[PDB]
Amino acid sequence: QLHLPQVLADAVSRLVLGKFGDLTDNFSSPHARRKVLAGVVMTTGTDVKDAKVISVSTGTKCINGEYMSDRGLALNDCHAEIISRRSLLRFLYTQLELYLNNKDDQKRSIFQKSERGGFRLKENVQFHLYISTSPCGDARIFSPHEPILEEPADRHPNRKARGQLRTKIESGQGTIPVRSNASIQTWDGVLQGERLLTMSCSDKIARWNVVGIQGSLLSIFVEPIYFSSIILGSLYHGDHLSRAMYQRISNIEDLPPLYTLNKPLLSGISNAEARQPGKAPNFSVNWTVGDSAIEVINATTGKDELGRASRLCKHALYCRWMRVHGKVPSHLLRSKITKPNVYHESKLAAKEYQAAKARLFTAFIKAGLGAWVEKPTEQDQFSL
Amino acid sequence: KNPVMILNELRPGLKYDFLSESGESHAKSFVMSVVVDGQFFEGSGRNKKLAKARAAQSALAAIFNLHLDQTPSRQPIPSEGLQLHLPQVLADAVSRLVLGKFGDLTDNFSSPHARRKVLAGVVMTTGTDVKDAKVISVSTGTKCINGEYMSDRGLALNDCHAEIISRRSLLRFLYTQLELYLNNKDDQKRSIFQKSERGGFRLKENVQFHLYISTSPCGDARIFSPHEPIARGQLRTKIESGQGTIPVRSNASIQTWDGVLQGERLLTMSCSDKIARWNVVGIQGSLLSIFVEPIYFSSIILGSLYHGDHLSRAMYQRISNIEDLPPLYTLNKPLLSGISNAEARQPGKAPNFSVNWTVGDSAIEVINATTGKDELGRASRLCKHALYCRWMRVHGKVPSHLLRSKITKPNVYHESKLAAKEYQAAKARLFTAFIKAGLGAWVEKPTEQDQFSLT
RNA sequence: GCUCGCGAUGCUGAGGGCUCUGAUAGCUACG
RNA sequence: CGUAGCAUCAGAGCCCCCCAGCAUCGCGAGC
Ligand SMILES: O=P(O)(O)O[C@H]1[C@H](OP(=O)(O)O)[C@@H](OP(=O)(O)O)[C@H](OP(=O)(O)O)[C@@H](OP(=O)(O)O)[C@H]1OP(=O)(O)O
Ligand SMILES: O=P(O)(O)O[C@H]1[C@H](OP(=O)(O)O)[C@@H](OP(=O)(O)O)[C@H](OP(=O)(O)O)[C@@H](OP(=O)(O)O)[C@H]1OP(=O)(O)O
Ligand code: NA
Ligand SMILES: [Zn+2]
Ligand SMILES: [Zn+2]
C-alpha cells in the first residue's frame, strides 16, 4: 500500500494480472491463454489507492511480410510490450480530448498547459511498464532463462555482440544484429521474400528511453513522456537489462532541449511468474482504460479475426490525432511547421523529435552498435 | 465458399491422388489431382489442403462456370486484337511451360541451380493454339553486378534480374533468327523474320512473345498491399545490396564512369521501369533496330503478387502522356494476367547465381550475379561484347542498302548504338514522357562503358 | 580480454506431415 | 426420433525441416 521499489513492482504486477482476470471472466475466457502479458499502470501518489491500470495486452509475434498495410490498418509488432505502449497512446489522446471538452472537465484530465507551449503531464503523474518476461534483443538474447544464485552476472561483457542493435527476423528464430552489409528494406524487396526485420523490443524500449513513449505525432501537442519504471515478471537479468535500456548509448549527445536519455527504475517481482505451458497463441489482446472489453488481434495479420483494423493501428491513431488537431488552437501547437495531411509528412512536422531520433541513430552507429533499421518508406505514405 | 466442400456436395465420391512432393521447408510444393466427369485436373500449393483446394478449383471452374472473383485478381485485356484464347488459360499455359522447361534444364528440379527466388521466361506464340507455343528463353535471379566488377570493355552483365536476363537471351534468339534468314536462301521460310516494306526486317504476322515472371516485377508494379486490394508511378533504381528498389530523385546527376566509383554508386533501373521502356522502344534494343522494326511483348503473366490496377500503372498507364513518337513506335499495352495456382512467398535469402538458357543452347549458363561473369570468370554469352559480336557477324552479311539506318565500317559499340537514329529518338520521347509526368529522370549508366571495340 | 578460423553440446519465429477431441455449417445412408 | 459414414474453425498429442544468432567448452592463429 506504500511505494518502495520492490513493493511498487509487486503492486503493478498484481494490478495488471487482476485487470486481465476481470477482463477474461476470471481467467476463464479463451482469450486468457498467453505466453507474455504486459501492462501499463499510472500512479498519482504513494498510494495504491491512486494507482490505475492504463492498459493490458498479450502477444509474442510480429506481422507476416505479406500483410503490411499501405494504409496503416495493420499492427506490425504484437509483442505484448509494444502493444501496451500503443494502448497508452489511446489513453493519452483520450485525456487530451477530456481536457479540452469544457473548462470544468479540464481539471480531471491528466494534462495541463505548458509554459513552453503545448501540453504536459501534471506533476506526480507517472507511467510504469510491466512485462511478464524480458524484452527480446539485448536484454534477453544472452540469457533467455530465469537467473540462478550461482554466477548471476555476465561473464563476457566486452564481446562485440554486447549492446548490438538486433532485429526480430521474420520466420527465423533469434534476434539478429544489424550486419554492416545492408541496412535498407524495400517494400518490393519484402513482398518478394526478403525477411521483414523489426527492431527488437529491447531496442524499441531504448528508443522510447530517448525520444519518449508518446511517438512523433503526439509530440506536436505534448512534451515528451517517459516510463518511470520497467518491471519484469520473469527472466530479470539486471546487468543485461540496464545495458539494453540505456547504458549502451550513454555516448548520445546534442539532444533537443526537452529530450534526454531516460533511465527508468528496473526491477523484477518477488514471486517470479511461471512459464506457461502449451503453444504460444497467435493472437494478441489489448485493453485501454475506458474500454468495455478486450480487443483481440491476430498477430501475424495485424488485424482482428474478422479483418477489421485495431483501435491501435497507424490509421486509427492518425484519426485520433486529427480529432485532437481540429480542437487545438494554432497558437497552442508545440510545432507550427506545416506539413500535408499524410502520415509520413505529419510525422516530419515533429522537427525536434526527428532531430532526437537522429542523435539516437548516431549514438548507436558511433558506439559500433549498428545502424537502426527502418521500415520501407512506403509504409507511412497514406492519408485519412 | 470452400471449393473442396462444394465439389463434395456435387460429386460425393471423391478420390484425390497424391502426386508426390517437391522441396523442403518454405520451398515445399505439393501437387494433388482429381478426376471429375472424366476430365483430369491438378493443383499446386505449399500444403496438401491448398493443392487439393486448387485441384477442386480447376474442377468446378472447368466442368462448371468459374468461381469467386476478387476483382484486382481479374485482368486487363490488351489494347486490340484479343487473339490468344481466354486470358487466364493462356496465362496458366505460359506459366506451366516456363516451369516445365526449367524442370528440364535442372534434371527435374533436382540440380543445385533449381533453387531460385524468381523464375522468368519468354514464350513464343505463332498461332491461336497453345499446342504450338514454344519456350524461347528461361532465366532466374534477383541480383545485379556490383560496381567493383563493371567492365570497360563489355565483358560483364550489369543486371541479372530474371526478366532482364530473359530479354537478353531473347536477343540471342533474334540474332540467331536473322542469321537463319541470311545464311541460306531457303532458311528464310523457317525464320521468324521477313523483309520490311519500309526496309530492313520485321516479324512475321502473329509471331508474339509473352513474358512470364514468377512475381510482379521489382519497382512500381510491386508497391502495393496484397491483402487490401482496392499508388503513384515513380521511376526507381535497384539498390546496392539484395532485392528491391528505391525511387529516383530527378535532381541527381547522370553517372560518369570513374566518378561513380569515387562517389555515388552505378545505379541500375528497376524492372518495372525497364519493362515500360520495352513497352515504348521495344525489346530488341538499339543495334537490332538497325536491322529490324520494333518488337513488343503481347502478354505479361505474373505467377504471384498480381494486382491489375498497379501492374497496369507500372506497365503503360503511368506514361499515357507520351507523344510524338517515331514511325513504327507505340505505347504497347499488353495483356496483364495472374495465374490460378499462384506461388507462395518463400521468406529467405535470394541465391547469388542467375541461370540463363535460350532455345538452341544445350545447357543452362550459370552467371555469378555479382560479378556479371560465369562460374569460371569467363564472359557470358549475354554480355555487351558477345551481343555486339553477333551483331557484327550479322552486319558482315546484310547488304548495305538493307540497313534500316546507314552505318559502314562500324568500330565502337557506342557509335554503332548511336547510329540507330529513330530508336534513339523514341528513347528521347520516353525519357521526356517520364519527366513531364513527374516521375523522374532515367539514370543513364556512364557511356564510357560502351567505348570498346571487337579487336 | 578481444577478434578470426575450425569443432562440440545446448538455447531461442517460420514451413510441412500424421493422429485424437469439441463445436459450427453442411451432405449422404439406414430404422 | 436416432445412429453411422463422407469443409471450416478451436484445442491436444507425435514427428520432420528450417532459421542466424546466442551460450558453454575445446583446438589453431592474430591483436
Ligand atoms: O514501435 P511500434 O509501436 O511498432 O511503431 C513504431 C512507430 O510508428 P507508428 O507509431 O506510426 O506505428 C515509430 O514512429 P514514431 O512513434 O517514432 O513517430 C516508427 O518509426 P518512424 O516514426 O521513424 O517511422 C516505427 O517504424 P520504423 O520501424 O520504420 O522505425 C514503428 O515501429 P515498427 O515499424 O516496428 O512498427
Ligand atoms: O538489358 P539491360 O541490362 O537493361 O541492358 C540495357 C541495354 O544495354 P546493352 O544493350 O549494351 O546491354 C541498353 O542498350 P539498348 O538496348 O538501348 O541499345 C542500355 O541503354 P543505352 O541505349 O543508353 O545504352 C541500358 O543502359 P542505360 O540504363 O545506361 O540506358 C542497358 O541497361 P543496363 O545499363 O542497366 O545494363
Ligand atoms: Na520509420
Ligand atoms: Zn519483443
Ligand atoms: Zn527486377
Contact A65 B347 (CB under 8 A): yes
The residues near B151 (Cβ < 8 Å, ≥ 6 apart) are: B372, B383, B384, B385, B449
The residues near B279 (Cβ < 8 Å, ≥ 6 apart) are: B296, B297, B315, B316, B331, B332, B333, B334
The residues near A234 (Cβ < 8 Å, ≥ 6 apart) are: A132, A133, A134, A146, A268, A272, A273, A274, A275
CA distance A238 to chain B (A): 35
Nearest residue to B295 via CA among B357, B198, B208, B359: B208
**Grid coordinates representing B229?**
486490394
CA of B158 to the centre of ligand 3 (A): 31
B415 phi, psi to nearest 5 deg? -65, -45
Name the resolution in angstroms.
2.6
Distance CA(B17)–CA(B1), nearest Å, equals: 23
**Grid coordinates representing B6?**
462444394
Distance CA(B328)–CA(A350), nearest Å, equals: 53
CA-based nearest residue in chain B for residue A303: B227
Burial bucket for residue B366 (CB in 10 Å: 0-12, 13-18, 19+): middle
CA B192 to chain centre: 19
Q: Please state how this structure was obtained.
A: X-ray
Residues whose C-beta lies under 7 Å from strand D: A 30, 141-142, 155-156, 159, 161, 164, 166, 169, 171-177, 179, 278-279, 281-282, 305; B 2, 4-5, 8, 12, 14, 24-26, 49, 52-53, 348-349
For chain B, residues classed under CATH 3.30.160.20 are 1-68
Residue with cell 484519426: A319
HEC assignment per residue over chain A: CCCCHHHHHHHHHHHHHHHHHHHCCCCCCHHHCCCCEEEEEEECCCCCCCCEEEEEEECCCECCHHHCCCCCCCCCECCHHHHHHHHHHHHHHHHHHHHCCCCCHHHHCCEEECCCCCEEECCCCEEEEEECCCCCCCCCCCCCCCCCCCCCCCCCCCCCCCCCCEEEECCCCCEEECCCCCCCCCHHHHHHCCCCEEECHHHHHHHHHHHCCCCCCHHHCECCCCCCEEEECCCCCHHHHHHHHCHHHCCCCCCCCCCCCCCCEEEECCCCCCCCCCCCCCEEEEEECCCCCCEEEECCCCEECCCCCCCCCHHHHHHHHHHHHHHCCHHHCCCCCCCCCEHHHHHHCCHHHHHHHHHHHHHHHHCCCCCCCCCCHHHHCCEC
Write out chain A residues lying below 8 Å of B348, CB-based: 171, 193, 195
DSSP state of B81: -
Nearest residue to A352 via CA among A273, A256, A274: A256
* Burial readout B159-168 (b: 16 or more C-beta within 10 A, e: otherwise): bbbbbbbbbb
CA of A70 to the centre of ligand 1 (A): 14
Question: Which chain D positions have some atom within 7 A of a protein CB?
Answer: 6-8, 10-13, 17-25
Contact of A373 with A197, CB cutoff 8 Å: yes
The one-letter amino acid code at B178 reads L
Q: Order of strands across the sheet with A126-131?
A: A265-268, A229-232, A126-131, A37-43, A52-58, A283-288, A295-298, A303-304
Binding residues of A for Zn(2+): 79, 136, 201
CA B189 to chain centre: 27
Contact B225 A69 (CB under 8 A): yes
Distance CA(B241)–CA(B113), nearest Å, equals: 21
Sign of the torsion formed by the C-alpha atoms of B35, B39, B44 and B45: negative
Distance CA(B252)–CA(B360), nearest Å, equals: 43
A321 phi, psi to nearest 5 deg? -65, -40
CA distance A60 to chain B (A): 19
**Grid coordinates representing B242?**
539484395
Distance CA(B141)–CA(B163), nearest Å, equals: 8
Write out chain B residues lying below 8 Å of A185, CB-based: 244
**Cα→Cα distances B364→B58, B108, B354, Å:** 33, 13, 10
Domain B1-68 in CATH 3.30.160.20? The answer is yes
**Grid coordinates representing B84?**
490468344
CA B194 to chain centre: 24
- Report, as residue numbers or ranges, the catalytic residues of B: 163
* Burial readout A37-61 (b: 16 or more C-beta within 10 A, e: otherwise): bbbbbbbeeeebeebebbbbbbbbb
